[PDB]
Structure 1
Amino acid sequence: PGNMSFVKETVDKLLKGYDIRLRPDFGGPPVCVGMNIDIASIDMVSEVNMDYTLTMYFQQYWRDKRLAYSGIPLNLTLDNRVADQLWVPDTYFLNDKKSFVHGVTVKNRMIRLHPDGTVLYGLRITTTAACMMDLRRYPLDEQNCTLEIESYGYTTDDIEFYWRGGDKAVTGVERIELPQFSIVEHRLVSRNVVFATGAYPRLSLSFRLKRNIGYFILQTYMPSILITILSWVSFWINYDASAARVALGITTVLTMTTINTHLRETLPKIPYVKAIDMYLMGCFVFVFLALLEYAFVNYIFFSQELYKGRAAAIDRWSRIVFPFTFSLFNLVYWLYYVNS
Structure 2
Amino acid sequence: NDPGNMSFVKETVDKLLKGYDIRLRPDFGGPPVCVGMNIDIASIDMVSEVNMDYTLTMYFQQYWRDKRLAYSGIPLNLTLDNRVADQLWVPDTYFLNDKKSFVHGVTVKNRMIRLHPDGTVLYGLRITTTAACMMDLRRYPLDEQNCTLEIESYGYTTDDIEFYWRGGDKAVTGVERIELPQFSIVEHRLVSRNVVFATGAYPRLSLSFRLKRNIGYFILQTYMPSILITILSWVSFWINYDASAARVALGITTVLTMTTINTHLRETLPKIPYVKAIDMYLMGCFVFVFLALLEYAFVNYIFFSQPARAAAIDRWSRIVFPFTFSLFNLVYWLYYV
Q: With structure 1 as the length reference, what TM-score do the two structures score? A: 0.93
- 3-state SS in 2 of match to 1:259: helix
Q: In the TM superposition, what is the alpha-carbon distance from 1:280 to its structure 2 partner?
A: 1.2
| Distance across 1 between alignment mates of 2:252 and 2:179 | 44
- 3-state SS in 2 of match to 1:135: coil
Segment of structure 1 superposing worse, 53-62 or 261-270: 261-270
Segment of structure 1 superposing worse, 115-124 or 264-273: 264-273
Contact 1:256/1:284 (8 A) holds in 2: yes
What fraction of aligned residue pairs are identical, expressed as a percent? 100
Contact 1:186/1:207 (8 A) holds in 2: yes
Q: Tell me, which stretches of 5 or more residues in structure 2 are unaligned?
A: none
| Distance across 2 between alignment mates of 1:262 and 1:52 | 23
| Distance across 2 between alignment mates of 1:263 and 1:130 | 23
Contact 2:103/2:126 (8 A) holds in 1: yes
Contact 2:162/2:203 (8 A) holds in 1: yes
| Distance across 2 between alignment mates of 1:4 and 1:231 | 83
After superposition, the Cα gap between the structure-2 partners of 1:297 and 1:134, relative to the gap in structure 1 and judged at 3 Å, is same
Segment of structure 1 superposing worse, 313-322 or 181-190: 313-322
Segment of structure 1 superposing worse, 202-211 or 328-337: 328-337
| Distance across 1 between alignment mates of 2:55 and 2:246 | 54
Q: Tell me, which stretches of 5 or more residues in structure 1 are unaligned?
A: none
Q: In the TM superposition, what is the alpha-carbon distance from 1:226 to its structure 2 partner?
A: 1.4
Q: In the TM superposition, what is the alpha-carbon distance from 1:250 to its structure 2 partner?
A: 2.2
**Which string of whole-angstrom CA distances, capped at 9 and with x for unpartnered residues, describes residues 244-299 of structure 1?**
33232223223334433444455666565321111112111111000110111111
**Which string of whole-angstrom CA distances, capped at 9 and with x for unpartnered residues, describes residues 194-242 of structure 1?**
1221111100001111111101111211111111012122222233333
| Distance across 1 between alignment mates of 2:151 and 2:194 | 12
Segment of structure 1 superposing worse, 319-328 or 166-175: 319-328
After superposition, the Cα gap between the structure-2 partners of 1:278 and 1:163, relative to the gap in structure 1 and judged at 3 Å, is same
Q: In the TM superposition, what is the alpha-carbon distance from 1:27 to its structure 2 partner?
A: 2.4
Contact 2:55/2:130 (8 A) holds in 1: yes
After superposition, where does 1:270-281 map in structure 2 within 5 Å?
272-281=274-283
Contact 1:50/1:132 (8 A) holds in 2: yes
Contact 2:141/2:213 (8 A) holds in 1: yes
| Distance across 2 between alignment mates of 1:142 and 1:231 | 34
Contact 2:41/2:56 (8 A) holds in 1: yes
Aligned-pair Cα RMSD in Å = 1.8
| Distance across 2 between alignment mates of 1:30 and 1:319 | 77
After superposition, the Cα gap between the structure-2 partners of 1:198 and 1:331, relative to the gap in structure 1 and judged at 3 Å, is same
**Which string of whole-angstrom CA distances, capped at 9 and with x for unpartnered residues, describes residues 127-156 of structure 1?**
110001111111111110010000111111
After superposition, the Cα gap between the structure-2 partners of 1:243 and 1:17, relative to the gap in structure 1 and judged at 3 Å, is closer
Contact 2:49/2:269 (8 A) holds in 1: no
**Which string of whole-angstrom CA distances, capped at 9 and with x for unpartnered residues, describes residues 4-63 of structure 1?**
211111111111111111111122211111100101110111110000111101000001
Aligned length: 334
| Distance across 1 between alignment mates of 2:270 and 2:181 | 15
Contact 1:48/1:270 (8 A) holds in 2: no
Contact 2:93/2:152 (8 A) holds in 1: yes
Contact 2:186/2:211 (8 A) holds in 1: yes
- 3-state SS in 2 of match to 1:302: coil
Segment of structure 1 superposing worse, 22-31 or 199-208: 22-31
| Distance across 2 between alignment mates of 1:329 and 1:291 | 18
Segment of structure 1 superposing worse, 83-92 or 273-282: 273-282
- Find the counterpart in structure 2 of residue 313 from structure 1: 312
| Distance across 2 between alignment mates of 1:242 and 1:334 | 36
Q: In the TM superposition, what is the alpha-carbon distance from 1:104 to its structure 2 partner?
A: 1.1
After superposition, the Cα gap between the structure-2 partners of 1:327 and 1:2, relative to the gap in structure 1 and judged at 3 Å, is closer
Q: In the TM superposition, what is the alpha-carbon distance from 1:313 to its structure 2 partner?
A: 2.2
Contact 2:51/2:270 (8 A) holds in 1: no
Contact 2:50/2:269 (8 A) holds in 1: no
